[PDB]
Design a protein around this ligand. Structure first.
Ligand SMILES: Nc1ncnc2c1ncn2[C@@H]1O[C@H](COP(=O)(O)OP(=O)(O)O)[C@@H](O)[C@H]1O
Ligand SMILES: [Mg+2]
Ligand SMILES: [Mg+2]
Lengths: 70, 48, 145, 80, 49, 69, 70, 118
């Protein structure tokens, strides 16, 4: 649980090719009093982030096993 | 009982002794027709 | 169901095409592995499906139109025959039953006939049976009119 | 001889089965929308080796500096 | 039960009896052949009181 | 909805569709039935809504649920 | 209409048996409605309403209707 | 109401059930568009098969959030997807690290088998 800082998808090679742009993780950075970490997350988070419409500088709640975000 | 193989054998007897492979005719229901062709192949594949 | 439990391969012969379609619907509803050959099956399709039914034991039931099945399709791969209906032509019935029963048969042959209790079919079967018994006693030459 | 060969071929012919309905599939498959952008979600079992694990650990260490498993499941998202 | 059926039987027209038999067999084989099972629904009144 | 037409059976490999064959005969059919009713059935019919697939029918029949004099 | 009779006798004497025999003999076409008086003591509507409903429920109507099907 | 609570009716039905380990799942959905395309690969110990997914099947599988390291059953009639267990780990992403330790064995037999429900 953090305010949001970095938000950067990491490109990866496509197993099926097709010249498309693929991501294998979405990267999020989080700041907390006396704390900061950067996380690599299941790409499925993209859909959660879309639904939640997180922007940089928002404080967010994200569940370690569920992949849910608020 | 093998009517059809007996027909083959009769024709083949006409073939060996009588040499008469002349254009014989057989009229038959539609369904068995292909089975007849198969058995001609099986019992005596020399028949056109 | 019982026959499948025993692993038998059963034929059903019927005079009516519409009941053939009904059987299609029934067998699909239960999902039995079945094939159909009738007066409308394409000739090549007839050959290939009979070859499949002889070779491919997996097809539990093969549905044929009774008078077209009479025409001499070799069904010695099957072991069970069921007459869904009758036209009361004894020669046709024997032809159908003989279909399964030719050289190369290796399983004991079971035939079952469906009869509707106390209906017209019941009376017809009763009288036919009685007459047949009488004949068999009197005459054994195996000929009829 | 020729007809024995023909018989042998006829044995194989038993494989033949009508499949014209495949065309009814193929016509429908084209009805995906023409040249729109596509979002794909993929999830697939990926084989792993200790060398690949070491390479991944090195990549994670490099990412931090900038700041033997048999089967594993990978996810992917693509826009094209 | 249908009186016309009885009359037909009385006629003795071998064809007519054969047809009757065919209809009987159809009825026995599956009712859908003779009359599709009507899909039951409520009676509709023309207008409320 | 009686189901999906048989003509689209091969449209997919794996879907929750149930396929039904194309109905036989003409599109429009007309038959004469006989149905037995009672006076109470007519009274109930004329008193409260009893069927329908519209939300209006749902609201009309869930209102005033108990029997009336 | 409105005719009423009383089957008077001791217990285990054949009153319900006679009623069910009448129902069977008349046939399934006609409406025969057996009741106990305890059923009339409803809680939602008055006893009169239940009695009148049972009265008109015992009178049958047979109609002919044409069904239009698409 | 009390008396009628005391009479029980049992209706037996036969259902066709698909049961598998997921090899991979693919879902191509158009942005700002309602068309979605997908196909599923599902394996058993003795056979493997691919299936191309309809709209309702895609919607159900998306709702269930099926992932390739799942073992799952597909009901062709009802359409519900139940996640029976896990086949292997989640490639060690940096979340949900060790919540899938309870591995389950691959199913065995015909991929589409008939079962009875009472
Ligand atoms: N005359 C009879 N013949 C055959 N069975 C009878 C006869 N009378 C009574 N019974 C049987 O015994 C039961 C008692 O009869 P019932 O009609 O309940 O008596 P009541 O209604 O007068 O109390 C009936 O349900 C029936 O099964
Ligand atoms: Mg012959
Ligand atoms: Mg009593």
């Amino acid at each position: 649980e953090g305010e949001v800082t970095e938000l950067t998808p990491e490109d990866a090679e496509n197993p099926l090719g097709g010249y498309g742009k693929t991501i294998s993780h979405v990267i999020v950075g989080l700041k907390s009093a006396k704390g900061t970490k950067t996380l690599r997350l299941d790409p499925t988070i993209y859909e959660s982030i879309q639904r939640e419409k997180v922007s940089i500088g928002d404080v967010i709640y994200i569940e370690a096993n569920t992949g849910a975000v608020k | 009982l093998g009517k059809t193989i007996q027909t083959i054998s009769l024709l083949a007897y006409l073939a060996c002794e009588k040499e008469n492979w002349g254009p014989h005719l057989i009229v038959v229901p539609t369904s068995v027709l292909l089975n007849w062709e198969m058995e001609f192949k099986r019992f005596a594949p020399g028949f056109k | 169901q019982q026959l499948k439990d025993n692993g038998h391969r059963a034929l059903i012969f019927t005079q009516m095409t519409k009941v053939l379609d009904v059987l299609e619907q029934f067998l699909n509803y239960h999902g039995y592995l079945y094939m159909r050959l009738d007066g409308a099956t394409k000739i090549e399709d007839r050959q290939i499906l009979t070859e499949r039914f002889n070779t491919d034991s997996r097809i539990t039931v093969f549905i044929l139109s009774s008078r077209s099945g009479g025409l001499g399709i070799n069904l010695t791969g099957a072991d069970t025959v069921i007459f869904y209906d009758s036209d009361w032509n004894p020669a046709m019935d024997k032809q159908c039953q003989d279909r399964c029963h030719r050289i190369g048969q290796t399983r004991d042959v079971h035939i079952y006939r469906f009869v509707s209790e106390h209906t017209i079919e019941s009376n017809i079967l009763k009288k036919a049976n009685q007459k047949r018994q009488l004949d068999n006693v009197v005459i054994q030459e195996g000929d009829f009119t | 001889k020729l007809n024995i060969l023909s018989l042998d071929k006829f044995k194989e012919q038993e494989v033949w089965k009508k499949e014209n309905r495949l065309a009814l599939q193929k016509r429908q498959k084209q009805k995906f929308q023409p040249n729109e952008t596509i979002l794909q979600f993929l999830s697939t079992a990926w084989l792993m080796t200790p060398a690949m694990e070491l390479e991944d650990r090195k990549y994670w260490q490099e990412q931090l500096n900038k700041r033997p498993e048999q089967l594993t499941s990978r996810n992917f998202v693509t826009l094209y | 039960s249908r009186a016309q059926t009885k009359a037909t039987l009385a006629s003795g027209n071998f064809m007519s009896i054969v047809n009757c038999l065919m209809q009987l067999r159809k009825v026995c084989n599956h009712p859908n052949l003779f009359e599709v099972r009507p899909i039951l629904t409520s009676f509709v009144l023309e207008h409320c009181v | 909805r009686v189901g999906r037409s048989d003509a689209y059976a091969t449209e997919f490999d794996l879907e929750t569709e149930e396929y039904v064959p194309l109905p036989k005969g003409e599109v429009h059919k007309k038959k004469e039935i006989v149905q037995d009713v009672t006076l109470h059935d007519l009274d109930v019919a004329n008193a409260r809504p009893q069927g329908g697939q519209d939300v209006i029918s749902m609201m009309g029949q869930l209102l005033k649920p108990k029997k009336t004099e | 209409s409105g005719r009423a009779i009383l089957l008077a006798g001791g217990p285990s004497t054949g009153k319900t048996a006679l009623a069910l025999a009448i129902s069977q003999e008349l046939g399934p076409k006609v409406p025969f409605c057996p009741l106990v008086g305890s059923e009339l003591y409803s809680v939602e509507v008055k006893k009169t309403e239940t009695l009148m409903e049972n009265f008109r429920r015992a009178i049958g109507l047979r109609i002919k209707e044409t069904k239009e099907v698409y | 109401q009390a008396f009628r609570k005391s009479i029980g009716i049992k209706i037996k039905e036969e259902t066709e059930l698909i049961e598998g380990e997921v090899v991979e799942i693919q879902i191509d959905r158009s942005i700002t568009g309602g068309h979605k395309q997908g196909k599923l690969t599902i394996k058993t110990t003795d056979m493997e098969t691919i299936y191309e997914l309809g709209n309702k099947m895609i919607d159900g599988l998306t709702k269930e959030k099926v992932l390739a390291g799942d073992v799952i059953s597909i009901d062709k009639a009802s359409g519900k997807i139940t996640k029976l267990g896990r086949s292997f780990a989640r490639s060690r992403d940096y979340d949900a690290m060790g919540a899938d330790t309870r591995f389950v064995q691959c199913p065995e037999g015909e991929l589409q088998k008939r079962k009875t429900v009472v």
